[PDB]
Design a protein around this motif. Structure first.
Motif, PDB file in Angstrom:
ATOM      1  N   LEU A   1       0.803  -1.212   0.000  1.00 17.02           N
ATOM      2  CA  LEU A   1       0.000   0.000   0.000  1.00 17.02           C
ATOM      3  C   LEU A   1       0.849   1.281   0.000  1.00 17.02           C
ATOM      4  N   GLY A   2       1.702   1.437   1.010  1.00 16.39           N
ATOM      5  CA  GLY A   2       2.514   2.639   1.070  1.00 16.39           C
ATOM      6  C   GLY A   2       1.839   3.655   1.970  1.00 16.39           C
ATOM      7  N   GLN A   3       2.325   4.889   2.013  1.00 15.92           N
ATOM      8  CA  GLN A   3       1.708   5.878   2.884  1.00 15.92           C
ATOM      9  C   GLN A   3       0.707   6.810   2.216  1.00 15.92           C
TER      10      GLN A   3
ATOM     11  N   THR B   1       1.486   0.254   4.419  1.00 15.74           N
ATOM     12  CA  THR B   1       1.476  -1.187   4.138  1.00 15.74           C
ATOM     13  C   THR B   1       1.211  -2.011   5.393  1.00 15.74           C
ATOM     14  N   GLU B   2       1.538  -1.418   6.519  1.00 13.65           N
ATOM     15  CA  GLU B   2       1.313  -2.060   7.785  1.00 13.65           C
ATOM     16  C   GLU B   2       0.946  -0.943   8.765  1.00 13.65           C
ATOM     17  N   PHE B   3      -0.134  -1.129   9.510  1.00 14.39           N
ATOM     18  CA  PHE B   3      -0.507  -0.131  10.489  1.00 14.39           C
ATOM     19  C   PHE B   3      -1.493  -0.644  11.518  1.00 14.39           C
ATOM     20  N   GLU B   4      -2.080   0.290  12.252  1.00 10.26           N
ATOM     21  CA  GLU B   4      -3.055  -0.033  13.292  1.00 10.26           C
ATOM     22  C   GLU B   4      -4.145   1.034  13.331  1.00 10.26           C
ATOM     23  N   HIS B   5      -5.287   0.634  13.873  1.00 12.44           N
ATOM     24  CA  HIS B   5      -6.436   1.506  14.028  1.00 12.44           C
ATOM     25  C   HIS B   5      -7.309   0.791  15.050  1.00 12.44           C
ATOM     26  N   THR B   6      -7.767   1.516  16.056  1.00 11.91           N
ATOM     27  CA  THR B   6      -8.580   0.884  17.063  1.00 11.91           C
ATOM     28  C   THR B   6     -10.052   1.002  16.687  1.00 11.91           C
ATOM     29  N   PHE B   7     -10.810  -0.075  16.874  1.00 10.63           N
ATOM     30  CA  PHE B   7     -12.229  -0.063  16.552  1.00 10.63           C
ATOM     31  C   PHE B   7     -13.020  -0.122  17.843  1.00 10.63           C
ATOM     32  N   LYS B   8     -13.922   0.838  18.013  1.00  9.77           N
ATOM     33  CA  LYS B   8     -14.751   0.905  19.217  1.00  9.77           C
ATOM     34  C   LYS B   8     -15.633  -0.320  19.410  1.00  9.77           C
ATOM     35  N   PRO B   9     -16.116  -0.522  20.646  1.00 10.81           N
ATOM     36  CA  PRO B   9     -16.978  -1.682  20.897  1.00 10.81           C
ATOM     37  C   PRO B   9     -18.243  -1.544  20.062  1.00 10.81           C
TER      38      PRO B   9
ATOM     39  N   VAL C   1      -9.494   3.791   1.678  1.00 13.46           N
ATOM     40  CA  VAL C   1      -8.141   4.177   1.276  1.00 13.46           C
ATOM     41  C   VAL C   1      -7.913   4.242  -0.224  1.00 13.46           C
ATOM     42  N   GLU C   2      -6.633   4.337  -0.608  1.00  8.44           N
ATOM     43  CA  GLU C   2      -6.162   4.411  -1.991  1.00  8.44           C
ATOM     44  C   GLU C   2      -6.771   5.639  -2.664  1.00  8.44           C
TER      45      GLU C   2
END
Length: 481
Positions: A426-428, A464-472, A480-481
């Motif tokens: 993916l990239g940034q 290409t690699e990341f994180e994101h928190t998803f609420k309950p 994206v893209e």
């Protein structure tokens, strides 16, 4: 430990645009006082509620089922045509209310045209007949000089509607359906209606009544498996407990694959790609009258959210799907003489239909799962699910392959989760995520708080690699893209 991995470069299969279909019956206030309210200040020229009309166009409905489930089994389409005023007032046995019939075939197709939905009509196999069915098809499709084709013209509508989907009977198995049949009666009948009808118009798709009795389905597939195109499946779930409700999205999964395999077992049906049409499915456990105005809350909306994700990745065997209704009756959009209100179920569609691709892409997730036991839909039918994920998701790509949507559902309430997502090469970029949740698992929108449960954007930097928190109890689509 949770984690999801998408590979936009690998397309798995298309996503039948018809999984997002809706249903609209002549039950309670779904039609009259719902999408149709003659001479109301909120209604337009043809009597369509403008406020409802918007909410409906906002979720680009693909195809719309009509005139019904139970209703249709004693409905004679000819009382819905011709100038109004002269249309007979009949008494509907299904929900026991008078039918002014001012909302007929012509009006439905108009409403479809207006919202850009492909009409899906279902014939009456209760008090109706094969001659009657043929005629309705003559009236809607063909262009010859046959009586009914011209009748369409005399009334409007010189060009043929071309209704592509025909529901061949409704829940004919049920002791509650007017003129209900046995497995063999209906089975041999489905073939007769589909056999002709299709000689008149070869292009139509036929949906035969299927249900939870294996012998029923099997006898339908065995008899009409060389002429029908789908086998109908109805799924209604619900319970007070949050999980008993959301977890049934994974019960629906096993159910569909069940029916799927029965089809594989009938040579003729398997040869032609007969598929499943989930033409009736929502949460429904609270109300049990004949208005069916179920008060949907966020809990239910999450279930709806999950179902769409499931379909998103199963549209190959269940290409056609229709929410219970979309108005008042088990309605997604609640109406009132002076307003509108969108329930969490409606929202789920708002979110997924506007943030979803036409192709499913290699997407692999890793959740903590659980087991459950609960009840269902108001008699509290007992059920059980095994290894239901706490997190699931589906990655779609736009047609032009320049846009990615990663829809994820965190089916936990007491938790947010910080799963490491990853998208091969993916990239940034600066993607934006639309997430849908609210106060508690019981939040719901009102006339004064049309926004308690809603969709909200937010920007993000993704790689290409990341994180994101998803609420309950949340449903999110990272665009994206």
């Amino acid at each position: 430990s949770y984690r999801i991995v998408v590979d936009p470069k690998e397309v798995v299969k298309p996503i039948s645009r018809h999984i997002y279909g809706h249903f609209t019956e002549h039950l309670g206030r779904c039609i009259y006082g719902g999408i149709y309210e003659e001479g109301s200040p909120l209604s337009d020229e043809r009597g369509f509620r403008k406020d409802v009309l918007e909410a409906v166009k906002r979720i680009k409905v693909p195809n719309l089922r009509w005139p019904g489930g139970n209703f249709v089994s004693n409905y004679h389409w000819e009382d819905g045509i011709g100038p109004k005023d002269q249309r007979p007032v009949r008494f509907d046995l299904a929900w026991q209310q008078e039918e002014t019939n001012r909302f007929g075939t012509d009006e439905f197709i108009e409403y479809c045209r207006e919202i850009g939905a492909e009409p899906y009509i279902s014939i009456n196999m209760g008090t109706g007949t094969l001659d009657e069915a043929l005629h309705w098809l003559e009236y809607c499709n063909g262009k010859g000089n046959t009586y009914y084709a011209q009748l369409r013209r005399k009334y409007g509508h010189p060009e043929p509607y071309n209704v592509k989907f025909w529901g061949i009977g409704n829940e004919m198995y049920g002791e509650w359906q007017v003129g209900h049949m046995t497995a063999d009666e209906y089975a041999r009948a489905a073939k007769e209606y589909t056999k002709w009808m299709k000689v008149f118009d070869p292009t139509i798709k036929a949906i035969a009544v299927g249900c939870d009795d294996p012998i029923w389905n099997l006898r339908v597939l065995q008899e009409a498996g060389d002429v029908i195109d789908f086998i109908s499946y109805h799924f209604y779930t619900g319970s007070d407990d949050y999980y008993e409700t959301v977890s049934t999205v994974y019960l629906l999964k096993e159910r569909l694959i069940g029916v799927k395999k029965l089809i594989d077992m009938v040579d003729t049906a398997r040869k032609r790609g007969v598929k499943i049409a989930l033409d009736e499915w929502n949460v429904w456990y609270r109300v049990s009258d004949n208005k069916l105005e179920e008060p949907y809350d966020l809990k239910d909306g999450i279930f709806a959210c999950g179902v769409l994700v499931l379909l998103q990745k199963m549209s190959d065997i269940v290409p056609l799907a229709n929410l219970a209704q979309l108005v008042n009756a088990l309605g997604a959009i609640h109406t009132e003489k002076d307003g509108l209100i969108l329930t969490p179920v409606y929202k789920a569609f708002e979110l997924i239909v506007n943030h979803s691709g036409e192709k499913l892409v290699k997407t692999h997730v890793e959740s903590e799962t659980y087991n459950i036991e609960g009840v269902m839909f108001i008699n509290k039918m007992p059920f059980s699910v095994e290894n239901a994920p706490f997190l699931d998701a589906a990655a779609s790509i736009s047609e032009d392959g320049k846009k990615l949507f990663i829809a994820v559902v965190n089916y936990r309430k007491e938790d947010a989760l910080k799963v490491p997502i990853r998208v091969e090469g993916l990239g940034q970029k600066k993607a934006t995520v639309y997430t849908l949740t609210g106060p508690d698992v019981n939040a719901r929108n009102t006339m004064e708080n049309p926004n308690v449960v809603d969709i909200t954007s937010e920007t993000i930097t993704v790689d290409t690699e990341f994180e994101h928190t998803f609420k309950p109890f949340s449903c999110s689509v990272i665009e994206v893209e």
